[PDB]
Design a protein around this ligand. Structure first.
Ligand SMILES: *[C@@H]1O[C@H](CO[C@H]2O[C@@H](C)[C@@H](O)[C@@H](O)[C@@H]2O)[C@@H](O[C@@H]2O[C@H](CO)[C@@H](O)[C@H](O)[C@H]2NC(C)=O)[C@H](O)[C@H]1NC(C)=O
Ligand SMILES: *[C@@H]1O[C@H](CO[C@H]2O[C@@H](C)[C@@H](O)[C@@H](O)[C@@H]2O)[C@@H](O[C@@H]2O[C@H](CO)[C@@H](O)[C@H](O)[C@H]2NC(C)=O)[C@H](O)[C@H]1NC(C)=O
Ligand SMILES: *[C@@H]1O[C@H](CO[C@H]2O[C@@H](C)[C@@H](O)[C@@H](O)[C@@H]2O)[C@@H](O[C@@H]2O[C@H](CO)[C@@H](O)[C@H](O)[C@H]2NC(C)=O)[C@H](O)[C@H]1NC(C)=O
Ligand SMILES: [K+]
Ligand SMILES: [K+]
Ligand SMILES: [K+]
Ligand code: NA
Lengths: 374, 374, 374
């Protein structure tokens, strides 16, 4: 007969036994503070200090670092071992030999492929001498005995698969590219000339033809960087503040003040809220195996061994997390005893050890995923 | 003076005459159950059984089935009726004849073009001996005399125009392509070699040049499938559960437990809610004509003859539906007597008979739309 | 100790001291009207007229007008000053001279690049003899002493960077293109042949090769318009109603009745709401400088000189606006005295004079931004 479930983040309330509601649309890039002494109607001398602090919206993007994009010049030469044999990016016809090669290479920016986008606000609530701070994801709720804070919002600026380009120390801003070349890179494309890491170019294709007249090449001669700069107003910029780059992840606060989200704060002073996720179930967790990759839009799968006690069944979520960042979650009805739960995730880096987690509790160790693009 | 309107799905309430509110963020891939005996404060012995069941979020995607994508090898031959004349996909130069043809063809997956995306949850509410189940679309509300259930959410995983690729019996997962070739398919593109149905290839272009030295071809020689596999981590996977393929439609439950939506449940025990859509207007419906296409991003238009009685005017919505799936809706202020209402829709298949509908009531017959891509 | 903040648009309420709540999901393309006499329980003879009018959802899109897209025929000629020298779009090989040129040109539609998308509803509230109308952006709130109206919604039909094509006097509808050519336009692409203004073509590239046999060209010979028409069902249409084109901006009401948003209306009859943005701070504004461009996805930056009095600090937003349309906003904690605030914006046209604004108050003059695509 019991069907415990903690996937509901929120409360049951009696609207007559609720004392305060704050409901408002808040500038995404703004913090908010509320302070009030909660006093009895007139029939006491007891007051409770309420102090709520909501921080500015933060974006967290799991990415794959693509390395640097380059500008360069396409040069044509004739040989009748070719002179341009040392050039990393080249193309030749063997009739008299005609040759193309890239030179005057210069990095113009750092590119990042978006894997996951998540927005959040840090929310701190003091009620009496209770003090609790939590990072609340957009469309999730802060839940406590006396205070509920729900954030509801939508943003459509960034999409998975977008490529972000930063031209300089671009704590400041960047460009969004929706068509960065991937499976086919031709000279002239956004992303045409890349260096994924320190050394080594991924060279673009040269789709045109040679003619042996003095060699000629009848394909495009203009680099992707120059073609993009020539129509730069066609592309979308974004701005950033307090950037935080870590391996395969970027966090910042978008200073775009045109964006808003919705905040609802409900307070009960005397009788506790009914926490809709309340349960007596107890969970133990360890990792079993992993497969798949970090830094990948295809992702990984973490297998967890999950022990349930004190309940016959428990509907809940098991997460793949590391250092308080979660990369995936699986909703599951656990049965008493041992359970095997597979969690699909995306993101992380080579040093990530993905742990099996429930709520704020995690396994003692995690597992590494494989590298992408091998 | 009267201005009846049923486009508002919700209730007017007096916050003092409301007995229970549930407000929470729910894992999209999780169900939720609430059971409670509603009892009088202390001054009676009468109790009402409240039982709410909210099912896991379902996605319904109206699609155009594109057929199978193929891998293949590009072969080059010389003829001085060509040997490769039986090859379906070929390219030749007539000087000595040089020829390209695709062979070693193999289907690698099934592709589907997204036309419409809609999310929903089935919601069942028992209040006393009243029992009602409804499929509630995201950002719509369940309305009854004593209980309101509103679902508010946003998802940004899929977009109209995306192409979904399933590699095997991919009850399991698939890939999202945002640049599947349409108006120009060149060999090497995602989607380059397609077979729309049983037999018959839509062949890709071969943009390169021949040279008569022994023939040479200086264009790309690598299939789209191989180019995509070589950078597979650049593409976004998704997972599925309890898939349901029907003609030009796919439904499933996304097991991504990182996604949440918002649920609000309001209960009044004694006095009924004010149903904001309440009205005495009566509607009769029949189809008149149709034009446009199923399986098409451009869509169709259903013309309806709509009779209004018992009201001078009625602001409402007329829908194009078949078998309890709706494909389009037009908001309209009807006038007493006959009205002509055009409803723009998208989706459906060759067997669809699009009916004119109001609320849960539909015309006796529907009309077929035309096929796309003729 | 004081920390005034007006970035919160909403109210604090005591759920016992609230008299009416309307909560509902409303068809986006529908208006809504609520009329009620607010009367005392039984212990008075005083009534307040409540009258709420919510208008249909409007979309406002800041765009860059791209001019007209053309259909045309690619012709091949041989010359052994070339005949086709007057043709604006041409390509030649100088061996006998082979030539390509476009002719039979015809405009097929007008194209617009999406820079910004915003949805809104005009909301009018009469409470007693108080009457106030405001345009409320989606995910913002109408706030008054006795009535709060919040709109919460999400739409995923249009995206920044999409190109909208209108084929005729397309008050009626249009097509969405997600891959309109920008940095590389080749003959055959959507957007291949453009005329940005009255005269002057931006000609596409012809990536193929000539051969001197009688000249031959082995590249694509089919215009982008014809290639798109041949697979028109692959593209997404949209419909429009009551269109309003102005320079670099389009407004309309989307008649898609499948879309909904959420409306919440809270009314207190006696005691005023606590306006969460209430403050004694006073602001004076003038422009200082501007840089950047209108009609550009990169945008502009307006520098404002902002004087704060009556408060030590004030957390607020400074906006860049002209004629009651706002193009950007910066959240900022002002300090008493003079402040310099930079506001990033996008949109507008050559005649726009971007002003520094706070709430409904603006500077006496604004500044012009520079033209894009120079
Ligand atoms: C969720 O999807 C993953 C991803 O694997 C699928 O990806 C699709 C894009 C498509 O290519 C499909 O063919 C492929 O299976 C599933 O994980 C995979 O499962 C297979 C079968 O056991 C393994 O061979 C793969 O190594 C494995 N990959 C990863 C990264 O784990 C997964 O099974 C599926 N379901 C769940 C519940 O996660
Ligand atoms: C809503 O749009 C449809 C779609 O037709 C338009 O599609 C645009 C993409 C663009 O190509 C435009 O030129 C085109 O008209 C309209 O339906 C069309 O109406 C015309 C005129 O009567 C007919 O010739 C078409 O057959 C018809 N097509 C379909 C599929 O019905 C429609 O009129 C418009 N308005 C409403 C209220 O639906
Ligand atoms: C917000 O971003 C703008 C845009 O400028 C940036 O755009 C990125 C896409 C990238 O190219 C980056 O290199 C570039 O700086 C910033 O405005 C720019 O600031 C620089 C430095 O002072 C000026 O040289 C530019 O003229 C100026 N451009 C515009 C349009 O104003 C801006 O500084 C940044 N921060 C804020 C708070 O707005
Ligand atoms: K080549
Ligand atoms: K060719
Ligand atoms: K060429
Ligand atoms: Na060529």
């Amino acid at each position: 007969t019991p069907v415990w479930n903690d996937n509901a983040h929120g409360v049951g309330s009696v609207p007559m036994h609720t004392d305060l509601e704050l409901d408002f649309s808040l500038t995404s890039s703004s913090k908010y503070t509320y302070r009030r002494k909660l006093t009895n109607p007139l029939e006491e001398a007891q007051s409770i200090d309420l102090h709520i602090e909501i921080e500015e919206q933060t974006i967290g993007v799991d990415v794959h670092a693509l390395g640097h994009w380059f500008d360069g010049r396409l040069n044509l030469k004739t040989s009748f071992e070719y002179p341009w044999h040392t050039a990393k990016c080249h193309y030749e016809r063997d009739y008299t030999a005609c040759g193309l090669y890239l030179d005057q290479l210069k990095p113009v920016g750092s590119a990042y492929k978006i894997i996951t986008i998540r927005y959040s606000r840090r929310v701190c609530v003091q009620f009496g001498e209770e003090n609790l701070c939590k990072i609340i994801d957009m469309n999730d709720c802060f839940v406590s005995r006396h205070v509920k804070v729900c954030i509801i919002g939508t943003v459509s600026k960034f999409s998975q698969g977008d490529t972000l380009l930063f031209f300089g120390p671009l704590e400041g801003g960047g460009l969004i590219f929706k068509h960065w070349c991937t499976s086919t890179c031709q000279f002239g494309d956004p992303g045409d000339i890349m260096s994924p890491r320190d050394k080594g170019f991924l060279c673009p294709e040269f789709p045109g033809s040679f003619r042996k007249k003095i060699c000629e090449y009848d394909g495009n001669m203009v680099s992707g960087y120059k073609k993009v700069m020539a129509t730069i107003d066609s592309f979308q910029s974004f701005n950033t503040s307090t950037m935080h780059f870590t391996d395969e992840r970027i966090e910042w606060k978008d200073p775009d003040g045109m964006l808003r989200d919705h905040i609802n704060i409900l307070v009960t002073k005397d009788i506790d809220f009914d926490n809709l996720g309340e349960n007596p179930c107890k969970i133990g967790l360890q990792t079993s195996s992993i497969e798949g990759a970090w830094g990948s839009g295809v992702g990984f799968t973490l297998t967890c061994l999950v022990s349930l006690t004190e309940c016959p069944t428990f509907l809940t979520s098991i997460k793949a997390c590391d250092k308080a960042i979660c990369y995936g979650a699986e909703s599951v009805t656990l049965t008493r005893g041992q359970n095997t739960v597979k969690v699909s995730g995306k993101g992380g880096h080579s040093g990530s050890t993905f742990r099996c987690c429930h709520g704020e509790d995690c396994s003692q160790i995690g597992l590494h995923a494989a590298a992408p693009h091998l």
